[PDB]
Amino acid sequence: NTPTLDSLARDLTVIAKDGTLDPVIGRDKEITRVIEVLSRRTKNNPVLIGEPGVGKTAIAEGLAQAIVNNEVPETLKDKRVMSLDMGTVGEFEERLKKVMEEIQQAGNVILFIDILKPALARGELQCIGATTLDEYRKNIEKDAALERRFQPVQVDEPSVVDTVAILKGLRDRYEAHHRINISDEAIEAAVKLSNRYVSDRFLPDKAIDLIDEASSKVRLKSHTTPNNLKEIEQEIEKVKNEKDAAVHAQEFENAANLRDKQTKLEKQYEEAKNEWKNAQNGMSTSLSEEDIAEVIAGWTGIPLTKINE
Amino acid sequence: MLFGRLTERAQRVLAHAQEEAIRLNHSNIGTEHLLLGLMKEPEGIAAKVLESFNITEDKVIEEVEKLIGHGQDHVGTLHYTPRAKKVIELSMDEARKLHHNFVGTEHILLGLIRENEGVAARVFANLDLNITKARAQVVKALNTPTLDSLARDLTVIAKDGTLDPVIGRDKEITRVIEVLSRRTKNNPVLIGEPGVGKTAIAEGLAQAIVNNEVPETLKDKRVMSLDMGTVGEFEERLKKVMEEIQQAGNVILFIDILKPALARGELQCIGATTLDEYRKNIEKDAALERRFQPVQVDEPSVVDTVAILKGLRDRYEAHHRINISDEAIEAAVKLSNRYVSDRFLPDKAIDLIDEASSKVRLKSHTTPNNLKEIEQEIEKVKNEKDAAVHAQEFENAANLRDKQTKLEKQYEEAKNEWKNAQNGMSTSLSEEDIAEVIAGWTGIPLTKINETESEKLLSLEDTLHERVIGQKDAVNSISKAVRRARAGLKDPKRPIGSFIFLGPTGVGKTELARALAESMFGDDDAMIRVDMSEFMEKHAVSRLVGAPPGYVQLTEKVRRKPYSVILFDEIEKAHPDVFNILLQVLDDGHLTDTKGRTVDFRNTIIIMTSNVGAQELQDQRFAGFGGSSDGQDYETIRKTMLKELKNSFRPEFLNRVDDIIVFHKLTKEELKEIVTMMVNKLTNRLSEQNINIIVTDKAKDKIAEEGYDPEYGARPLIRAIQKTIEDNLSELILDGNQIEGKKVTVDHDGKEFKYDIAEQ
Amino acid sequence: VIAGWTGIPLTKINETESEKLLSLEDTLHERVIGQKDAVNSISKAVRRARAGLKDPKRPIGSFIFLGP
Amino acid sequence: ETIRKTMLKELKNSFRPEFLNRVDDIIVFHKLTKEELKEIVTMMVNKLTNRLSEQNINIIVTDKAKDK
């Protein structure tokens, strides 16, 4: 069960087994690419070539997701996924010698990195690199032993259409708290303008940025009371505090009227609240395209009139 | 909560004091009016208090009448004195002690007796009635458990009214609630510099519950605050608090793991992180980028800051019992930002007005050399009495006891009459008190700060002529152009001035530049000198503006002193990319560093010194025999140099210059008065030694031509004076104070400089 | 007493602080023979600062030596 | 003073303009002549003998040896 690897790193099959995180949507193309490289006899160490932030983290997350879903092939069946973070880096070399021994004996441990030359030369460790392109051509290419052992994988930003399916797939997972209705028009409109203005962090992280504070002026805006409960609740507040003072002051001449008034106001508050929600829960507050572009107006400073065309 | 909790009896006291001022011919309502008004309302619980203490209405009227004076007053404008306002502040504390939530006539007496400084307090003391006696009289005459333990509730504290109410956030607070109108996209982030006051935003949300101004969603909504001062098991307690928020539906998180929680939307968390650490973690995460957006929450403007302190006026003018005027608050913020503008706003004004109000309180709460001379005699008599009792001399001790009692009787009468006039008047906050305090923070003399900004501009030319003699064309050209933007005729966004120094080097461009800051900012050293000699490569452009993120000057320095003069040397020798940055300064009037902070240059003067066209000016001087081009009009000289200037630069760049300044040449007669000025300046530094130095015209003419050179200018003049006047002057200084307190005369006989020592 | 805290001889401590700068050129030439053109330049430039002519905040001297 | 003027122009070629303005006085040195070197060796003889004061040994060097 590789106890050393389970304590010095983070296991991915345990996290994916519960499925408490959002599923990886839109990276289905890379799912078949990672397993394909691991099945090759030569160069069975794929490397996530790309800028840091393009979505390389989701590539490793989706690899262990197929194990629970029984979508991985027989060659990659029932194999745990282990990732070693760079923040736990002499005595440093004394720990990596024991971890590699357990991987060879088990035969189902897949390393994930973000000394080891003899280990990679024999292909004993099937580590998956995650270094950027700039650092891959400076430390890995300069060494001939690792040149024929690490197979670069082109992991770049997805297409515009591919990002659209991400929002639709996760839409059902975004409505479970207040049961609101989201229009389908805002889904396609959240990817056209995303690349127009924000083009400095690549897809899909820069793509899903328009729907953060775009259309939020409809649903709860009508849930307010137009000078209805602003005064009813205030009357209840003053009666309660004044009632307690009259008890200790031996003044029950006016306290008797206060109790009846307070009870009547409490009944009225419940009736007013019930009628408010009954006439509003039936209607649905869907999104509108006229307010989607309002959030991007303040990100860059472009006037809303110029954007709304 | 001023009049909301007032009952029928409490409000009657307010009207009674109003009418009593007219009959008593008092223009203000002090403690003498409130005490009498309470005695005329025997309906509250306190009615039995005065009856049980043998206190009637007719006795207190005459007792308080003698203490107060009588005289002419002003009809109307009968407002409350700040000293009498202390009753309202203290009455809230008394209710919290007994866990009560009502205000009535039973707290007025407690407030007037807990001050020990008003007229009403002295009446109680004279009637053998103190706080302790009335303390027991009133007594007998009368849920998210996890969230509350791991955080603090704001609506509970704000319900009592102990924290200072948020005043001046009439737009930032309303901006947050307007966006808070849906289950999703309802997580605003407070983005601003550290010190702008983003903590009070959370308090304002809970304040609407107390005032019943909150909507139905925010009605009776517990505003929870998660402070950063309470920081495996890390991600364990936070997963239980979030469960209580969803079920209760009235808990608001205030931060200063949670990504799946905001994926759907259920917590109306409002961030408070600074801009320098908000785009580095929230933006890089896709999940956190679906709920949080930066919001423009910066320091308030000059006018906005004044309104902030107006709401908090009652929290300070009554605590210190010092009257705060409207003119004092507006002048405090304007002067503070002029000199000390490092701590931002409005936090730097709270402490400034606190010390200003405390300082005047200290000066108006002392003994005017009347009770001191009496108290010292009482103490001396007490020591004398001890010297008699221990000596077993009671024959002389009998007189000591009688004298001690007599002195104490006079002490109480003198103390009461001293404060009889003090209580009838209120100590306002004069504008001079704020000026004195702010002057001690920067060392600026009080005279410089105390200016109406009306005569300084008029006498701008005279001040400049004191340090620079000659070239009146350049002095008047800059003086007329600088005041165009000050009066508001020019575009407010554009800087005040964008003058360009042109001409031969060494003529005195630096000397005139420093005089501009002296006559405007009142500081000779308020000037930042940036040299373009080190700015040659293309990569040097990312130095003065700031290091771009991912790798690791002028912007940092200018931010500390925005009211300075930015001077550049050898601007003609610089990278072409540098000129693009300079154009933006003179067009929009502000810049932005790599950290997202927007610096301001509206108060900065940009001067670019270039050596181009110097060869043309010197040729015109010797172009005509028997004279020079000095007699030509200044406009003609400007036009000739304008064509040469645009040849090496871009035509559009020169369009942004308010006025092109071309310096003249130094003649023999001009240098004569330059030497005279330096002697006078040295005499000023010798005022401590009280030594007068007089230089004859013969010496001035001889020394002027010693280092005369058209290419150098006035630079060799300093060297000549040091090796001629200062050499012999220093020798006589170290001779046993030989020339101390005397008069030294410098005369040139033709070859040497004979020094004559005479009396002063 | 102050001599035993820094090791300075009693003769050096007991000085008027005026004759030392008057005979500065003679004392300097005891250890420096020749280059009198620079001895006089620095001797006349230090007495002015001690005379109070120079600004007190600035240092006493800012000489820049040049040559082989 | 003429030597100072010539050196000053080249000094500011590689230096900042205002850097030399704060200097109270620029000092320029010279070379060493044969006559000056004779007294330099003499000073070292006196210093060496002074360090041997506890030895109570007198050292005298002829002018012929100093020149050699």
Ligand SMILES: Nc1ncnc2c1ncn2[C@@H]1O[C@H](COP(=O)(O)OP(=O)(O)OP(=O)(O)O)[C@@H](O)[C@H]1O
């Ligand atoms: N009209 C004047 N009256 C009195 N002093 C003057 C006048 N014009 C120039 N000076 C003196 O000339 C001196 C010149 O030295 P400074 O370091 O200011 O250089 P500058 O000539 O302005 O040249 P640069 O711009 O190259 O630094 C100043 O210190 C100033 O006292």
Ligand SMILES: Nc1ncnc2c1ncn2[C@@H]1O[C@H](COP(=O)(O)OP(=O)(O)OP(=O)(O)O)[C@@H](O)[C@H]1O
């Ligand atoms: N004016 C002088 N008269 C006599 N001896 C001198 C004089 N100037 C220098 N010397 C001698 O020069 C010798 C060398 O001194 P030092 O080792 O300090 O180097 P330096 O010549 O000043 O050069 P550097 O600046 O390169 O260190 C000293 O032992 C000193 O006796």
Ligand SMILES: Nc1ncnc2c1ncn2[C@@H]1O[C@H](COP(=O)(O)OP(=O)(O)O)[C@@H](O)[C@H]1O
């Ligand atoms: N607009 C305002 N109205 C009232 N009080 C304010 C305001 N802004 C700041 N304050 C007060 O200034 C104090 C200092 O706040 P500060 O520490 O600067 O907040 P932050 O650290 O979020 O900038 C707070 O206690 C707050 O009560």
